[PDB]
Design a binder for these strands. Structure first.
Length: 67
RNA sequence: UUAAGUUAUUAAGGGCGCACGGUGGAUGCCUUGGCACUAGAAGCCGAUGAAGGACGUUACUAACGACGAUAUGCUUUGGGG
């Protein structure tokens, strides 16, 4: 993905962001209710969201390099 | 059967020697933090938030980094294995 995340159509990114945020919410919710036992997913979901915002920022800058 | 002389026999204490304590840094070490030389800057920012912080962020959490809700980091170019 993280290459062709840049190939996504700027609404797949938007829906992808909120799907990933619901996934992170469920993970944090079941870490507390103590049944997770694979705690490394939390970190990588965070970084995915980071990935997804970064490219969605830079489209914006290139969207105003022309205008 | 008398006059006389004398010593230990506790070492409570004293000096010597012995042997384990407490103590803390004499020896060696350190070189993590500066005296000074050379060179480079440029003294150094921002009304694009400038100037030190406060709260936070790790799967687990107690001070500095990141700076930061994209948070114990994100993308990209080049090194590197």
């Amino acid at each position: 993905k993280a290459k062709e995340i840049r190939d996504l159509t700027t609404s797949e990114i938007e829906e992808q962001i909120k799907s990933s945020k619901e996934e992170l919410f469920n993970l944090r919710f079941q870490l507390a209710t103590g049944q997770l036992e694979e705690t490394a997913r939390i970190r990588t979901v965070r970084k995915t969201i980071a990935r997804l915002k970064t490219v969605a920022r830079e489209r914006e800058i290139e969207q105003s390099k022309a205008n």
